[PDB]
Amino acid sequence: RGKPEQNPQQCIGCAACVNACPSNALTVETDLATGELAWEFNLGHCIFCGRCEEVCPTAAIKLSQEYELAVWKKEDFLQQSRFALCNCRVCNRPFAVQKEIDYAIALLKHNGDSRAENHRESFETCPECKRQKCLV
Amino acid sequence: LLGPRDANGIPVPMTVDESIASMKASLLKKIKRSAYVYRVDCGGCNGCEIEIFATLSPLFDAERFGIKVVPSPRHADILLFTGAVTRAMRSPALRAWQSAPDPKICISYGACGNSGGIFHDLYCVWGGTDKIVPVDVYIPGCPPTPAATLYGFAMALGLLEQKIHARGPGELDEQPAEILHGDMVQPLRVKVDREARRLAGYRYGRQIADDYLTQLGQGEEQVARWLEAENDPRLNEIVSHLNHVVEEA
Amino acid sequence: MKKVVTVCPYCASGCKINLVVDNGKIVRAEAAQGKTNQGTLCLKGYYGWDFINDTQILTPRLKTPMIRRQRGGKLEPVSWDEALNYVAERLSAIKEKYGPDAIQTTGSSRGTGNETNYVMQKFARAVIGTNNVDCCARVXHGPSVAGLHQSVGNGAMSNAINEIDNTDLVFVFGYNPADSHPIVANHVINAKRNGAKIIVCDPRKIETARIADMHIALKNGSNIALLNAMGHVIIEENLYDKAFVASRTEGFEEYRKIVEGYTPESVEDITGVSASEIRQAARMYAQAKSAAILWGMGVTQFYQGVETVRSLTSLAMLTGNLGKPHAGVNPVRGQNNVQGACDMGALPDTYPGYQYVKDPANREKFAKAWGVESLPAHTGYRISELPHRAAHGEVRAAYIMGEDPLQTDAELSAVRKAFEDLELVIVQDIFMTKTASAADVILPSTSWGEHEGVFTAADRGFQRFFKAVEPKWDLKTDWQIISEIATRMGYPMHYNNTQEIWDELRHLCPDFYGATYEKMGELGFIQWPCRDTSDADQGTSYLFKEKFDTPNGLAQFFTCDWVAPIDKLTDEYPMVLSTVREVGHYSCRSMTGNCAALAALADEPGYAQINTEDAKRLGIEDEALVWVHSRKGKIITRAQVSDRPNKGAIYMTYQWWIGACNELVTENLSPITKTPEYKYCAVRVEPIADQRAAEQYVIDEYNKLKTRLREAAL
Amino acid sequence: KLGQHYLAALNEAFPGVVLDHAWQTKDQLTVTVKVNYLPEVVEFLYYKQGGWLSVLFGNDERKLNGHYAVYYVLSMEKTKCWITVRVEVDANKPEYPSVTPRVPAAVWGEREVRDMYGLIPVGLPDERRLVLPDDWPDELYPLRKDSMDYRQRPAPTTDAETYEFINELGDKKNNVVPIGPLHVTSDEPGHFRLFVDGENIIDADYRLFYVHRGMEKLAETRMGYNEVTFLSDRVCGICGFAHSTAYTTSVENAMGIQVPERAQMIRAILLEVERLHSHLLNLGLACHFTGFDSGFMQFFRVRETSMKMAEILTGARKTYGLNLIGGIRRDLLKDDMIQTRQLAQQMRREVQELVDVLLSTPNMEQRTVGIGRLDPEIARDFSNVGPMVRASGHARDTRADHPFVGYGLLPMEVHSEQGCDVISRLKVRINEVYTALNMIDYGLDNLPGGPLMVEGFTYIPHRFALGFAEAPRGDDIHWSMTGDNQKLYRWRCRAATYANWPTLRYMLRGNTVSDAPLIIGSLDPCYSCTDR
Amino acid sequence: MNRFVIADSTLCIGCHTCEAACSETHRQHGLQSMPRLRVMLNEKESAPQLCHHCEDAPCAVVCPVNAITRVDGAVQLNESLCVSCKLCGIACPFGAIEFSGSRPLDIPANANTPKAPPAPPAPARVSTLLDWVPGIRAIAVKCDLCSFDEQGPACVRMCPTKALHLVDNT
Ligand SMILES: Nc1nc2c(c(=O)[nH]1)N[C@H]1C(S)=C(S)[C@@H](COP(=O)(O)OP(=O)(O)OC[C@H]3O[C@@H](n4cnc5c(=O)[nH]c(N)nc54)[C@H](O)[C@@H]3O)O[C@H]1N2
Ligand SMILES: Nc1nc2c(c(=O)[nH]1)N[C@H]1C(S)=C(S)[C@@H](COP(=O)(O)OP(=O)(O)OC[C@H]3O[C@@H](n4cnc5c(=O)[nH]c(N)nc54)[C@H](O)[C@@H]3O)O[C@H]1N2
Ligand code: SF4
Ligand code: SF4
Ligand code: SF4
Ligand code: SF4
Ligand code: SF4
Ligand code: SF4
Ligand code: SF4
Ligand code: SF4
Ligand code: FCO
Ligand SMILES: [Fe+3]
Ligand SMILES: [Mo+6]
Ligand code: NI
C-alpha cells in the first residue's frame, strides 16, 4: 500500500484510473496544442486507496513497497506523461489516444482477427464519422 | 487582519520577509540535534493526528533523534500542520503561526494537509496547508506511516536527503503497450479474473487467478499444486469455482 | 391515475394528448386516438408538458400581479385588486384624454382557447370601442388569408389534414412539414405510401424533399417567376379543365395575357432552376387527377406574399383542383389556435365567424346582441406596425396578451424603443419572458394544462381540451381576468365557464351553430362551417362544393410581374438570411424552454445552417461560433455546416434567446397586409479568432439574461 | 411486519394525521404526518412509546414533490423497529413547528437544519449557528441543491470568532479556561469555555465544528456509490469501519441486495475488532489523566496486538477500505482465521492482567468517582447512545435491538452499569472488550461459506433506507437515498458522539478544572466523526 | 440469431422524437439520460444509427472487465461494471457507443451564487473518448434494447412515422 507508480510503456491513456480516483490525484487534460493528452499523478492528493491499480486495463499503475516519500518542493510529487492524440481520417479532429487505438488493434489481433491491422482506417475514425459511414 | 487577502477577500498564503527567510538553513543546522515541534491539527481525521502522536510511542521514537513535542507555539521551531484548512480553523492556525518565533519550519503532514486530500474542492476547506502558510517539507500519506514521519523529520533536519523526484514526459510514453498474459484468449482470462475478484478480492483474486494461469500450463500438475500446497479450504473453493468458469466457457 | 384528454398546445396539427394525472400532478403524456394524430405524437407532444411545474430551466413561471411604478423602477409584486384597478383606471384615463384607438389589444393564439379570444375582442370592441385587435396571424398567414379572400373567397384551409392521405399529387411550396407539423409530414408519408407523387419547391434539401419524385431548388424570393413559368407551361401546352375554367372562374384572359410574357427560359436564371424540370413539374401537376397545394412561410413572409398566394390559387384554378375531395389549396396554419384566433375575430377587420366589419348589418347585429349602440367600424392598427404607430405618436397603450414581441418581432431595437415611449404595456402571460420583463403592468395567467376551452386545428377543425390540474398560485384564467377588468371600468361582464361563452358564440355566429360541446366532447373533430346542432352535421370536410363563397360566386385570376426584395446583396453584406423553424423547440422558447427533455437536445445559441462550400471558403468550421453581422445588429450562433442548405444563403433559427436573429431582420412591411419580411435580409457571417472567449461570451450572457428574469419575477 | 402496533397506537391517538406510511424493510417504517401536528407525534412516540430520537435531518425535494422534507428517526426499544416521522415543509416559506421545547434531543439537529437548508423551526430556543463557521455569509445554505456550487468559497466576513457563549449559572465575574481548539493531548480541534470560580466549574459552554469539511454536499455532487465508502473511512481513523458499514447497509437496505452469508458476519468480526482498537485507546487515555503512565504505554502495547490482527485481517493501519455495496472487498483465509483466534485469547490474557490497575484502586477510587456524573434522567431526554447511556442504566445497544450484519449468529451481551461516574464508563468498556473477544473466539471458527460479492445490480432511483452500525462510541445512523445508477440524491450521517455532545454541560458542572479533560475523554469524543 | 432495431431512412423525418424517447425511458429508470440512437444526416438520407447487436462483438472482445455480454440474443452492456476504459468505442465499427456520465441530481448546470466568487469552469468539449470532468464518471452508453422496460423499445413505440422497427431472429 505504498506510492502509486505508473509504467509509461503500458499506459494507453484511458482515463479509467482517473475516473476511479476518489481524491482526484490522477488528472488528465486534453492539450490541443501538441495534440497530446497530459496524464498527471499528484502524490499530495493521493489517499493510497488503490482504485487505480484495480481499474487499470493494462496494469500500468501499481502501488509499490515504497513508504519514504517526503519532499522539499511540491513539484517532486508529480508523475507526468504525454500521449499523442490520434486525428480522425474523415475530419481531422483529435478524438482518441493513438496508443490506445494501437492497443485495441493488438487486442483484436490476439483472439483471432486475422485482418485486424488492415482495418486500421476504421479504428482511427471518430465515432461520429463511423456512424455516417453506415448511413450510406 | 491576521492573514493577507485578495481584492475579493479570499485568503492567500503569507509571504515571509527574506531577511526572516534568509537564515532558515542556519536554523536547520541549529535545530539538527534538538527540534521543538508543535502539532497544529486543523480540519482533519484523527488518523493524521494519532500517528503523529505515535512518533514518540514504543514502536517508533522521536526523542532519540532530538524531536520533542512542545505545549506552546512560543517554544516551537517546527510547526507541524496536519489537516485541510477549514474556514473555522484558518484563524487559529494563523494565530499559531504568528505566535511562534521567527524563523519557523513548517511541515505539512498527510494528504489532507498537503493539498486537501479528498476534500480539496469544497466550500468549507481552503485546501491544503500551503494555501495559508508557507510549507518547507511535505509528507504524504493517508495516514503517513511512522517510518515516513521519521524520514520526513530526518530529511527536514538534514540527517537524510530527498529520495523521490518528479517524472516528466519522455520517450517511454510513446513506446507501445504489450498484451499481458498473452497465451490464452483474453475473454477467458477476463472472465476468470472477474470470477476470482468476486470470490477472493481485488488483490487476492488477481493473485489466485494468476496462480491458476501459470497452472493452466500443465492442467493436472499445477491443479495438483493449487490443491495440495495451500491446504486452505477457502483457496481450494476459489480454484474449483475458477476451474468451472474456464471449463464451461 | 385518471386520464384527461387534451389537445396539444404547440402546432396547428391538433393532436390529442391523454394526459395521465395522479394526485394533482402529471406523470406522463399518452398518444390518444384522435382524428389528426391517430395515436402518433412528436417529441413536443410527448415531453413538452412539464413547463407548468415551474422548472425554472430558462424562465420562472408567473405567480403574482406586478406593477412597475416608473419606467426605471422595478416590477414589485401587487395584489390582484390594484393590479386590475390600475389596469382599469389607466385605460379609462387614456380613452378619455387621447382616443379609444390610442389603446391597442392583442389576442393570444397558444393555450388560451377560442372563448378567451372572443371575450378579448368583445372587451375591446365594446368597452374600449376599437377594432385594434390583432393576433399574430398578422406575421403569419395574413397574406394567405387576404389573397384567398380576394381570390377564392374563403381564407382558411379548404380541405382536411386527413384528406392529403388520398391525393394523387402533393405540391409543397415553401413549407417544411418535417419540422413544423410532423404529423402532417407523416400524412405526406402515407400519401406517398398510397402512390401519390410529391413535388417540393424549396431552396433547401428538406426531409420532405427526400420523398419527392422531383425537387425544385430555386433562388430565395423568386416564387412568382416560377409560378408564372409553370402556369405558362400549363396554358400553352393547353393542359387544364376548361370546363372548370369556363363555368366556375372568371378572369382567365387577363391571366393569359399577363403570364404569356413569362416563359421558362427567361426565368431559367431568376429562379436558378432549369426549364426542363419546370415543364416536368407543370405537366405532372396538370395531369394529376386529384392534387393539393400545401404552402407555408416561404410564400406569405415576403414583400410579394399576397401576389404569390394569388398566383398559387389561380394556378389551382387552371388545374381544376379546387372544390373536389383530396385536392384544393391548403395553407397550413401556424400556432395551434391561429386558425381559431382568425375565426373568433381577433383580426382588425372582421367579427367572429368570418364576418367583416365593413358591413353595417353585422355592425347592427353585434351592437344589438352585446349592448352598446354600434361598435366602432374603422379597420384598426396592426401589431406589425405597432412600433411605427408608437414612435410616430399614434398609439399610446398596448394590451399585449400571450405573445412575445420582444423576441418574435422584426427590428427588436425598434420594438424596445416603442415599448419605452408607450407609457403602458400590459402583458398577460404565463412566463417571465423578454416582453414580460419590459412590461409596466403584468398579470399572471392560467397555462394550457390548467383550464378549459376550444382549439381549432390547421384544417379549420374544432377540438376540445379538458382541465387536468389545478393552478397552485390562486391565479385565474384569461377570460376571468378580461371579464373582471371590463367589470371594474365598463360593461358588467361575468362568465361561469367556457360553455356559456361558446353558447354566446353560437348565438352570434350562423357558421358555428352546429359545433356544440357535447358533439365535440372527448375525441371529436368538427370542421366549420357546421350549421345544424343535429348529429346531422358532423362538420364540412371540404369547401367549395357548389359555390365559391365569392360576391360573384366565381373565382378570380391574378398575378403580377416579379420584383426584387427590398434589401440588396452589397459589398459588405453578400449573404442572404432566412429565419426558419426547426423541430424540437417552439417559438420564443418560453414553453419548450422549461422542458428538461427538450432542453437536453439543443440549448444555446443555436445553429445557423451553412453550406459546406460557403464555409470551406469563408473560413467557418462545423461547430464554430460565428459572428453574424447585419445592418441593425451583430449576434453569435454556432454553425452547422452541411450541403443541405443552398449556396449563398444561411438558414437560421429565431427560437433562441442568446443570438436571436430578429435583431438582424430589417422590418420592411408588406404593401397592404403589413407583414415583416423574415425570409430575406442581407447579412454577413464572419468567424471568431478566439473561440474560447466567444464560448465564455455565450455562457455569461446566457446567465446575465437569466439573472434579469429571475430578479424581476421573483 | 414490524411496527404495526406503533402505527395503530399513533392512529388511535391521532386519527387523521398520518397522511402516508410505507415500509423500507421489515423493521424499518416511515410515516408522513401533518406539519402543524408534528411536535405532538414525535413527543408521543418518544415519551409514551419509549422511542429514542436517533437522527433528524432536512432534505431538498423541491423537484420531487415541491416541498422540503424533515425526517425524524425514532428507535422503538420496548417488537423493536425504526419509525421515521416525515413532514412536508412549504417551499417559499420554509417554517415547521419545532420539537426542542418538547423533546430535548432535538436541539442540534434543528440547529443544523437552520444552517444547511435554511429551514426555520419556530419556537427553537437555541438559535445560534452550529455547524457553519463564524465567517460564513448568512443566506448561503450549503445543502440546498441550488444555493451554490460545491466548489464555491465565499470570502470570510471576519477573522475573529463571533460566537456567543451562554453562562447559565455564572455571571460577569467568572473567568474562562479554554481547552481548545489548539490544545495538547486533545489531538483534535474543539473549543471549550469553562466558566470557573476557582478550580470548580460553575458552567461549561463549548464551540465545535472546527473540522466541518462539508462532506454531506460533496457526497452527492462529485462522488458516486462505491466511492463514498472511501469518504466514510476518511471521516475519523477509528470509526472508519463503523461509518462504512453504516453507509453500506443503508444502500443495501434501500434495494433488496440479498448479500452472501459470510459477507455479513465478517463485517461483524471487523466491527468488533475495531472496538478492541478504540476502547483500549480510551483506557490508555483513562490512565494518562488518572495518573499512571506505565498503565498507558502498556495499554498502547495491548492496542498494538489489536492492531496486529487488523494488520492481518486487512493489511492496513487506521483508514482501510474493505466494504463495497454488494459485499466486502478483500477476503479472509484459513490460517488468518485460525491465528486471529488465539491472539484474541492472549489479549484476554493480557487485558486481564492490565485491568488489575483498577483492582489497585488509589486514583481509580477518588479521581474517577463522583466526577462527570451524567444523570440518567438527562441521558434519557437527550438520547445519548454510547457507553454513557449504558453506564447510566439504559441497555441501549444496536447489536441486540437491531442485528444488522448477522450479529444474531454471534454471542451478544449488553452490559449496563448503575453508577454514572468516569469509572462506571470504564467498566462498560472493560466488559465490552471481553464481549468482543468472545465474538472473535466464536466467529472465525464457524464461517458459513459461500460467495463474497454480489454485483451487477441496478440502483432504483429515489429509494431510501436507514443504515446503522454499533460504533465504539454509540451508534451511527446513516440515511441515504439513491438518486440514479451513479450518484446519491442525499446521504445523511450522524456520528456516535453527535447525540453524546449536548450533555457535556451537565457533566462538567460542579467539577474542577484538573479533572475536566478526564470528563471529556471519559466518553471518548471523536470530533472528526461529529464535525463531518 | 440477434435482436436489433433498424431505421427506415425513407420514412424518417428527423423529428428527434426517438432521441427524446430513448433519453426519457432511461432517465425515469436509473440509467444514463443520453440517447442511445443518434439521427445522422447527409444530403439524400436521414436515419438514426444505434447498436447493430452483432453476432460476434468486437466491443465485447476488448472489454477488460467483461461488462459486455450476450443475453437474450442481444449484446448487452452492464453500466455498473464499466470502468471507463473507452476501448469499446474504438473497437466498435459502427460508432454505436458513446461515453457520458451522470450529472449531480436536481442541481442546475450553473448554480453559482453571486455571494461568492465563481467556480472554475468546465473544460472544453473535444471528444467523448478523451474528455474528463472531475465530478462526472463517463460510462459506455449503448442500445440495451430497453430490456428493463416491459413494453419493448420506446424508440419503436414513440416514432411518429413508424420508421423504427425491431428486427428479431429467434
Ligand atoms: N424571425 C421570425 N420571426 C417570426 C417568425 C419567423 O418565421 N421568423 N414566425 C412568426 C409567426 S409565423 C408567428 S405565429 C409568431 C409567433 O410568435 P409569438 O406571437 O411570440 O407566439 P409564441 O412564441 O407562442 O408566444 C407565446 C407567448 O404566450 C405565452 N402563452 C403560452 N400559452 C399561454 C396561455 O395559455 N395563456 C397566456 N396568457 N399566455 C400563454 C407564452 O408564455 C409566451 O409568452 O412568430 C413570428 N415571428
Ligand atoms: N417546431 C416548431 N414548429 C412550428 C413552429 C415553431 O416555432 N416550432 N411555429 C409554427 C408557426 S408560428 C408557423 S407560421 C408554422 C410555419 O411553418 P413553415 O411554413 O414550415 O415555415 P418555415 O419553416 O419558416 O419555412 C418553410 C420553408 O420555407 C423555405 N423558404 C425560405 N425562403 C423561401 C423562398 O423564397 N421560397 C420558397 N419557396 N421557400 C422558401 C425555407 O427554406 C423552409 O424550408 O410553423 C409552426 N410550427
Ligand atoms: S488506467 Fe492504466 S492505462 Fe489507463 S491511464 Fe491509468 S495507468 Fe494508464
Ligand atoms: S491510490 Fe487511490 S487516491 Fe491514490 S491515485 Fe490511486 S485511486 Fe487515486
Ligand atoms: S491525511 Fe488522511 S488521515 Fe490525515 S486528516 Fe487527511 S484524510 Fe484524515
Ligand atoms: S404535431 Fe403538434 S400537436 Fe402533434 S405532437 Fe407534434 S407538437 Fe404536438
Ligand atoms: S422518431 Fe422516427 S421519424 Fe423521427 S428521427 Fe427517429 S426514426 Fe425518424
Ligand atoms: S456496440 Fe458495435 S460492435 Fe458491439 S454489438 Fe453493437 S454494433 Fe456490434
Ligand atoms: S468502457 Fe466499459 S464496457 Fe467499454 S471497454 Fe471499457 S470497461 Fe468495457
Ligand atoms: S431500442 Fe431502446 S435503448 Fe435502443 S435506441 Fe431504442 S429506445 Fe434507446
Ligand atoms: N465510534 C465512533 Fe465514530 C464517532 N463518534 C462513529 O460512528
Ligand atoms: Fe471524423
Ligand atoms: Mo406562425
Ligand atoms: Ni469517530
How many whole angstroms separate alpha carbon C117 and alpha carbon E57?
Answer: 60
- Give the whole-angstrom CA distance, residue D70 versus residue E109: 26
Task: Cell numbers for C66, please give them.
Answer: 406586478
C-alpha torsion angle, residues A63, A65, A70, A76 (rounded to 10): -50
Fold for D215-531, please state it.
Answer: Cytochrome-c3 Hydrogenase; chain B (1.10.645)
Residue E144 in contact with partner chain A when CB distance is under 8 A: no
Residues of chain B neighbouring A84 (CB-CB closer than 8 A): 174
Q: Which amino acid is at C560?
A: C
Q: What is the chain A residue with the closest CA to D311?
A: A1
Q: How far apart are CA D35 and CA D45, in angstroms?
A: 16
8-state DSSP, D402: S
Indicate which atom in ligand 8 lies nearest the CA of residue E91: 3
**How would you write chain B as a 3-class SS string?**
CCCCECCCCCECCCCCCHHHHCCHHHHHHHCCCCEEEEEECCECCCHHHHHHHHHHCCCCCCHHHCEEECCCHHHCCEEEECCECECCCHHHHHHHHHHCCCCCEEEEECHHHHCCHHHCCCCCECCCHHHCCCCCEEECCCCCCHHHHHHHHHHHCCCCCCCCCCECCCHHHCCCCCCCCCCCCHHHHHHHHHHHHHHCCHHHHHHHHHHHHHCCCCHHHHHHHHHHCCCCHHHHHHHHHHHHHHHHC
Q: Name every chain A residue with its beta carbon within 8 A of the beta carbon of E84.
A: 14-16, 19-20
Contact D532, D214 (CB under 8 A): yes
A134 assigned ligand-binding residue: no
Amino acid sitting at position C584: G
Whether the CB-CB separation of D325 and D248 falls below 8 Å is answered with: yes
Q: What is the Cα–Cα distance from D411 to D437, expressed in whole angstroms?
A: 10
The parent domain of residue A126 ranges over 1-134
Beta-bridge partners for C328 = C292
Q: List CB contacts of C352: < 8 A, sequence separation 6 or more.
A: C118, C121, C343, C344, C345, C505, C508, C509, C512
Q: Which amino acid is at D475?
A: D
D287 touches chain A (CB under 8 A): no
Phi, psi of C346 (to 5 degrees): -85, 50
D305 inside 8 A of chain A by CB: no
Domains of chain D, by residue range, sit at: 4-122, 215-531
- CB under 6 Å to ligand 2: residues? C 11, 140, 173-176, 179-180, 201-204, 206, 220-221, 223, 296-298, 334-335, 578, 580-581, 583, 586-587, 651, 655, 679
| Domain D4-122 part of CATH 2.40.37.10 | no
Cα dihedral angle (D238, D241, D242, D248), rounded to 10 degrees?
150
A and D in touch (3+ CB pairs within 8 angstroms): yes
E strand or H helix at D387: helix D387-392
Which residues neighbour C450 within 8 Å (Cβ) at sequence distance 6 or greater?
Answer: C52, C467, C468, C469, C470, C471
Instruction: Strands of D413-459 (E only): list them.
Output: none
Q: How much helix, strand and coil, in percent to the nearest 5, is found in chain C?
A: 35, 15, 50
Nearest CA among D112, D402, D440 for reference residue D246: D402
CA separation for the pair C568, C575 (Å, rounded): 10
How far is residue C681's CA from residue B26's CA, in Å, rounded to a whole number?
Answer: 78
State yes or no: C359 annotated in a binding site: no
Pairing mode of beta strands C328-331, C350-351: unpaired
The answer to whether E74 and E147 have CB atoms below 8 angstroms apart is yes
Q: Report the residue of chain E nearest B198, measured CA to CA.
A: E65
**What range defines the domain where residue B62 resides?**
23-157
* Angle, alpha carbons B101-B102-B107 (nearest 5°): 90
Which residues in chain D (86-105) have CB-CB distances under 8 A to chain A? none
By Cβ distance, the residue of D153, D235, D330 closest to B45 is D235
- Are D321 and A50 inside 8 Å of each other by CB? yes
Q: Give me the residues paired with residue C635 across strands.
A: C628
What CATH number did the domain enclosing B84 receive?
3.40.50.12280
**Placement of cell 364576418 in the chain:** C355
Residue C519 backbone dihedrals phi, psi, to 5 degrees? -70, -40
Q: Which residues have a Cβ under 8 Å from the Cβ of A73 and sit 6 or more positions away? A: none
Domain C142-335+552-557, CATH: 3.40.228.10
Enumerate residues preceding breaks in chain B (C to N > 2.5 Å): none
Distance separating alpha carbons of residues E30 and D490, to the nearest angstrom: 15
Tell me how many degrees the CA angle C714-C712-C74 measures, rounded to the nearest 5.
125
What is the distance in A from the centroid of ligand 1 to the CA of C260?
42
The torsion angles phi and psi of C102, rounded to 5 degrees, stand at -60, -35
Kindly tell me whether chain C and chain B come into contact, counting contact as 3+ Cβ pairs under 8 Å. no
- Is D227 an 8 Å CB contact of chain A? yes
B partners (3+ CB pairs within 8 A) are A, D, E
DSSP D6-50: HHHHHHHHSTT---EEEESSSSEEEEE--STTHHHHHHIIIIITT
Do residues B196 and B205 make contact, with C-beta atoms less than 8 angstroms apart? Answer: yes
Contact present, D70 and D58 (Cβ < 8 Å): yes
Is the separation of the CB atoms in A101 and E90 below 8 Å?
Answer: yes
In single-letter form, the type of residue at position D509 comes to: R
Query: Between chains, do D316 and A1 touch, taking CB under 8 Å as contact?
Result: yes
With CB atoms and an 8 Å threshold, state whether D486 touches E134: no
The pair phi, psi for residue D174, each rounded to 5°, is -75, 145
Nearby residues of E9 by Cβ (< 8 Å), 6 or more positions away: A135, E45, E46, E47, E163
The residues facing E142 across adjacent strands are: none
Peptide bond into D181 cis (omega under 30): yes
Annotated active-site residue C44? The verdict is: yes
- The resolution of the experimental structure, rounded to one decimal in Å, is 3.4
Question: Can C74 be counted among the known catalytic residues?
Answer: no
Q: Label each residue of C206-268 as H, E or C.
A: CHHHHCCCEEECCCCCCHHHHHHHHHHHHHHCCCCCHHHHHHCEECHHHHHHHHCCCCHHHHH
E33 touches chain C (CB under 8 A): yes
- Asked if residue C367 lies in contact with residue C377, where contact means CB atoms within 8 angstroms, the answer is no
User: By the 8 A CB rule, do D153 and B126 touch?
Assistant: yes
Task: Give the count of alpha carbons within 13 A of C107, CB side only.
Answer: 37
Could you tell me the maximum CA-CA distance found in chain E, to the nearest angstrom? 61
- D215-531 has the same fold as D4-122: no
In testing the pocket of ligand 5, which one of B42, B112, B139 has its CB within 8 Å of the most ligand atoms? B112
CATH of domain C3-47: 2.20.25.90
Cα–Cα distance measured from residue A78 to residue A27, given in angstroms and rounded to the nearest whole number = 11
What is the identity of the amino acid at C529? P
How many angstroms separate the CA atoms of C245 and C640, rounded? 47
DSSP characters over C553-578? SSEE---------SS---SS--EEEE
Give the CA count within 13 Å in the CB-facing half-sphere of A103: 28
Whole-number Cα distances in Å, D281 to D284, D298, D498: 5, 11, 20
Longest dimension (CA), chain C: 71
Q: Does A135 touch chain E (CB under 8 A)?
A: yes
Torsion angle in degrees (nearest 10) through CA of E51, E54, E58, E59 = 40
Mention every residue, 6+ apart, whose C-beta is less than 8 A from residue B71. Answer: B38, D184
Rounded Cα–Cα distance for residues D60 and E108 (Å): 14
Alpha carbon distance C317, C250 (integer Å): 10
Instruction: Give the span between the Cα atoms of B78 and B74, in whole angstroms.
Output: 11
Contact yes or no for E16/E39 (Cβ under 8 A) = yes
Look-up: residue for cell 419572458?
C433
Neighbours of B26 (CB within 10 A): 10
